[PDB]
UniProtKB/TrEMBL annotation:
Active-site positions on this chain: S219 (nucleophile)
UniProt remark on cofactor binding: Binds 1 Ca(2+) ion per dimer.
Natural source organism: Cupriavidus sp. P4-10-C
Protein name in UniProt: D-succinylase
Gene name of this polypeptide: DSA
Disulfide links within the chain: C162-C193
Required co-factors: Ca(2+)
Keywords: Calcium, Hydrolase, Metal-binding, Signal, Zymogen
Amino acid sequence: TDRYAAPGLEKPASILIDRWGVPHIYAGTLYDAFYAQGFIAARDRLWQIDLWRKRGLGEMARDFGPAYVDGDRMARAVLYRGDMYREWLAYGSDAKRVAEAFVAGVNAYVALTEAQPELLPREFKQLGYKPSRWRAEDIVRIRHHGLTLNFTGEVDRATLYCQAKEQAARADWLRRELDPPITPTLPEGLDPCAVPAAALKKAYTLATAAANFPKEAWSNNWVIAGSRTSTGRPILANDPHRAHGAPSLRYVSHLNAPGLSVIGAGEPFLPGISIGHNGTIAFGLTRFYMDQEDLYVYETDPAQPKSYRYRGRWEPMETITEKITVRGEAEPRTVTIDFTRHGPVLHADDASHRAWALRAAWLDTGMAPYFGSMDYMRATNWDQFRAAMNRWGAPGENQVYADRNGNIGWIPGGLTVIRPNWDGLFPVPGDGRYEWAGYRNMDELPWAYNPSTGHIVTANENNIPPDHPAAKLGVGYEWSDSSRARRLKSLVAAAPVSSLRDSIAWQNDTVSLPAQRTLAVMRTVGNAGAAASLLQDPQVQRAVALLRGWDGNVRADSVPAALFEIWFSNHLRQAVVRAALPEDAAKLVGAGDAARVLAVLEQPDTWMPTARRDEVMLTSLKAAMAELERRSPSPEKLATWGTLHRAIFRHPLANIVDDATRAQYNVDAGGIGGSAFTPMNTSYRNSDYHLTAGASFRMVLDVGNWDQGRVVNTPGQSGDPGNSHYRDLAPIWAKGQTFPLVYSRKAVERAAEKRIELTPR
Ligand SMILES: [Ca+2]
């Protein structure tokens, strides 16, 4: 038992940390639970949460030097600047008391590190600075870490339309799948060539990218009704697919107080729980892609470049002044930030009298990511959960719902822009001809409650029914590849009665529908023309032999899997694109959209002759086979997919510390199966196939028999590299295994390994 003073805490609070590193918080008052959550979040993840706050408020340069000034300036440009009275009330009715309690707990732990420097996290020692104190408003004003779109897509699409002109729609069809597959409409008044991609992306990255330390400066979910489970009770599963790292993106915790009994995960800097259950209802999420960013293009006064044309008048930009403290400079830099009425100015070119601003719904009221969970942490039925989702802001999400009374449900939510006269897939001129007409009420989106089929699966695909009214409202056209959704829907529908173990297995599924679709095309390649010549090549034959007996299961011990991932990521698609498009467009498209390239492979008709399709397939397959042989120890002992596909959890400082320190900061869990397209999403980088993203936190819940719920996180619950909970969960995660999400007192007491005691002072 450890005992600490808790100034600002109302009543004694106790925390039991179980043997997997999950803290279980027992407080005597409602808001004390969040005080304790802040203390414990700081105890485990202080450096991580301090860094998020430091990046969000634009205070990086204060400690990391002049290389960080531009990022600090752009970070402050995308802080919430709106009405704070409305902001506090956007998430439910008591969000301000919650945040204030949470940062009082964080601040108590920060004060403790000042009194007991042995508790100071080692990244602070390494880099020569100290953690800050927090204010409650920090929690809601930081926005730029929320998943969003589609500024980048608008920029890429306009850039393509500019360079390819008459061939634009043809090339953009390969570049990005739309669902529903509309023809994008270049807005009246927009010159696609007046969108400088490099300059705009540089500013957007500076405003939004996570903290970076370069050497130069130094989802699936589903819910199943009791009629279809082995338990007779609902089952709810969720594995978000996000960037991997050490420490992990999300953090598992458990909060108990009068009127509060919620367990699950969220980002460790945010109060409350956004994925999990509260002993009555359960909830999990996957991205739902409402278009929440438009790029606005302005004409500026040649006599006054800080003025832009709006409704026939010259309207002045709002200019604010910021002071940025810089390590090694005695005076703070004085910088300015310009805004139009629509948002922060990203870039200006006074030669062409043009400026560009980001109109981001996530800069409006209520868009602190996941903080709408304030209003459903305590919901006890569907009416309350559906109501809480009315005010859900960011990111756009599918929520699946279940409760211990046997109900199951689904409701997507997120701030939804109404564009009366453009489709949001291109930038618009900002002179008033293109204006958001407000926001949709969430009752305009589809939902389901106890559907007849007894199951619901969501996985980032467009799940708006085409005959539902929302399908015509322009909610969004850019969704993720639907392979995971089609695969999990097959699996769930094919299992009349399933267990928790079945749902855990489905989270670990590694069958790739893109692989199966490509193999199906391969088995029709014609032994004629240029293909017949390649079919006499030994290297081609060895690859054809490897693929001809593979079922598309991307297992870690599969050599055909290694061949396919090399082929499908770094060779095939690029070759198909170059064969189908002129060079300039093909260079911009690169590997293009996987679903759209597969469709071309399956129907090459208007893109290339069938014999050209075969020749490209074999030519790129030969090159992929050569790469596999170069990456294998000998051409007789070929590398398995797991041999290449390494699960390394990278620390933000890995590149600026020595080799011994990098081994302690990074966590290597070895080789793994899967790809971006398998339900067990293990996304990778193309340079060396190392893991970059996928499920870290996973959960499968027995809804009603709560102690039977199963979860994992990776690499661990602790952010302290010296702690065994820094890296103890990665081997469990790597085996597709879970540990119990203990919930009842006896179960929490049974699994407890450490007790922490907080005393008011
Ligand atoms: Ca848009």
